[PDB]
Ligand binder design. Structure first.
Ligand SMILES: [Cl-]
Ligand SMILES: [Cl-]
Ligand SMILES: [Cl-]
Ligand SMILES: [Cl-]
Ligand SMILES: [Cl-]
Ligand SMILES: [Mg+2]
Ligand SMILES: [Mg+2]
Ligand SMILES: [Mg+2]
Ligand SMILES: [Mg+2]
Lengths: 164, 164, 164, 164
């Protein structure tokens, strides 16, 4: 896999199965999968930061990002490509050096520009054919972890080294 | 596909898997799928309004409808066919120009009268027989999106046009 | 099908997938499926009462039973066979005239004594082999509805008559 | 099977599908499966204590451990192997007399040292290959029950004895 300086990810439909839980009082939930915490683990193990880009804006996601020590969080993003370009500029890198995973229409422009594009198996067909690697997992099933492990070429030897 | 002037939809079992979450305090939840927001996107892209018909009446659904900018919301509806007919009268269209998706007994009368009837794959067989197009997805899996994309003939060219 | 005068049902693992949601504050949730409301519909259409027997005791279930107009509710039940006997004795009913659906160890004694025993496809093997009819559905997927429809012989003629 | 004196288990990804539900207010949920309560039942029927080891630390899990009468609860565990070793010392047993089920990186060292290692079908490949018995079930689907029933050789005769 090519040199990656930054891993970027959408939330809904990647870190979740797209589920948005509403109650009667104005509260909202998302269901994350702890498996995806290993995606952050491996990225940080390899010295690579992770950022979240989302068009939603919730305290749900601020708290999850905090729990997992995610390096960057941008919410209420209207243009994910622009947001990614701004973060690349912030860090002194280019989009070819970015791996991005997303699942829907508002991810497409960014997916087409990054060094490595990932799309979960659960995403719409139009979006899946933008993926530059095959991801078997669906949103919420640990597909962010799957993406990171493929992008970084994590193998049995890496595993053996971290469980010493 | 027939000329459609209005898309109507049930909620529970279409926008959800039928799940109704109850706690100990009288609160209630539903789990929506963000994928279904694209059904509204495509309808509005084609200049078609969307209405929700539901026999339930919840702040859950009021809030979800307003998040997605749904054009019409009728809750506490005991007679979905008559609600659809009244909206058709208001809009100056007929039921043959309506696409409706529903999943259960109280949807049947309306399903039999519309121009295009959709039923999720998870619905009872005697309701599925009423569908006039095949839907692969189950309730809560993005079947409202699936329905809209089929009804409106959304294709790769439409996709390419919206992503710049 | 043999004469059934009462339908009895467990909750967890039948009306749900066994899920028990806990938060940080002492609240609890269950996820019901609206499909199962049709089981009450068909029972009542045929003049048959429904009772719930559960070893748990929650406001969750009290509220669900009330909305669905369930005829009898017994919570905190230590011995489901005894509870069924005592209800049936009040009503004049023999266990051979009862259909009961349950999923786990504390259901077995009653399942072995009723006229029609149902067990969801998701239940443990030792319990499934007690079922006297095959149920395809899993807990929380509408298996109470499936059971009722099979028990009462609900057919296309019934459907046609209710949706005219 | 091997003689087992202690059953140990992780929570997230074993007793759950890995789901971690976050709301807007700082609360958190897990979804347990009631089927897993039979794992405690069978362990206690055979006179074997059960302990939980988890790196998380929540009121959610305090409550579940209480409901199920779990013998030992260790949360915020930094090193699961060390925690198991210390508990074994207290009990005067060795790791070869322990059955442990876990699903992820921080379970690997302990899985490699116990007498019977179990890993759910949903776990990462690198962890599944450490399992010494095959488990069909995924996290949250009753895999703790499956593990206990296999480890203790529960059979139809055992079932018949408990439902008298
Ligand atoms: Cl978004
Ligand atoms: Cl859920
Ligand atoms: Cl309804
Ligand atoms: Cl019970
Ligand atoms: Cl852990
Ligand atoms: Mg998304
Ligand atoms: Mg419905
Ligand atoms: Mg049960
Ligand atoms: Mg775990």
């Amino acid at each position: 896999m090519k040199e990656i300086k930054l891993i970027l990810t959408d939330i809904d439909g990647v870190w979740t199965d797209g589920g948005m839980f509403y109650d009667q009082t104005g509260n909202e939930w998302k269901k994350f999968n702890t498996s995806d915490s290993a995606g952050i683990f491996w990225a940080h193990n390899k010295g690579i930061p992770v950022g979240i880009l989302t068009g939603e804006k919730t305290e749900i996601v601020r708290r999850r990002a905090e729990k997992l020590k995610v390096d960057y969080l941008f919410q209420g993003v209207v243009d994910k490509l622009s947001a990614a370009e701004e973060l690349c500029n912030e860090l002194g890198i280019n989009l070819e050096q970015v791996a991005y995973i997303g699942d829907d229409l508002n991810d497409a422009k960014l997916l087409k520009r990054v060094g490595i594009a990932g799309v979960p198996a659960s995403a719409p067909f139009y979006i899946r054919r933008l993926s530059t690697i095959f991801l078997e997992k669906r949103g919420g099933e640990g597909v962010f972890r799957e993406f990171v492990e493929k992008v970084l070429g994590i193998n049995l030897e890496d595993f053996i080294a971290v469980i010493q």
